[PDB]
């Protein structure tokens, strides 16, 4: 088959809910319907009686980001596509992952929350 051109981020986005978002699109309808059971099994939630099934390609992004994050929801679906074996997927949410804190005790620059 050989595969490949350059580079591995297809959309240049400016955030890491765009980067969600666009990996819940991109699977596809057999990847999808499976991997929406597979959701269970990493949440492990009350998702249930009509509430996974509700979820979807937008409900799906807003409610991980909703109950964890943008930052959190991407390794959480990284979690689960090594379960059904997709590297590619993997490297891309990979690749988009902002969170660098180092030290907790005099960690002083600027102010990393308001400004």
């Not at 959309?11 to 990847?31: F, I, K, M, V």
């Not at 990493?42 to 799906?60: I, K, M, Y």
Request: proline share 2%.
């Amino acid at each position: 088959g050989s595969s490949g051109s350059s580079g591995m981020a297809l959309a240049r986005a400016n955030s890491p809910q765009e980067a969600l978002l666009w990996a819940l699109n991109d699977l596809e309808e057999n990847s999808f319907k499976t991997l929406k059971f597979h959701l269970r099994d990493v949440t492990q939630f009350h998702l249930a009686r009509g509430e996974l099934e509700s979820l979807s390609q937008v409900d799906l992004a807003s409610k991980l980001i909703s109950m964890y994050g943008a930052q959190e929801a991407v390794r959480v679906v990284s979690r689960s596509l090594l379960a059904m074996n997709l590297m590619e997927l993997v490297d891309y949410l990979n690749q988009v992952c902002l969170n660098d804190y180092r030290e907790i005790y005099r960690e002083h620059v600027s102010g990393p929350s308001s400004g």
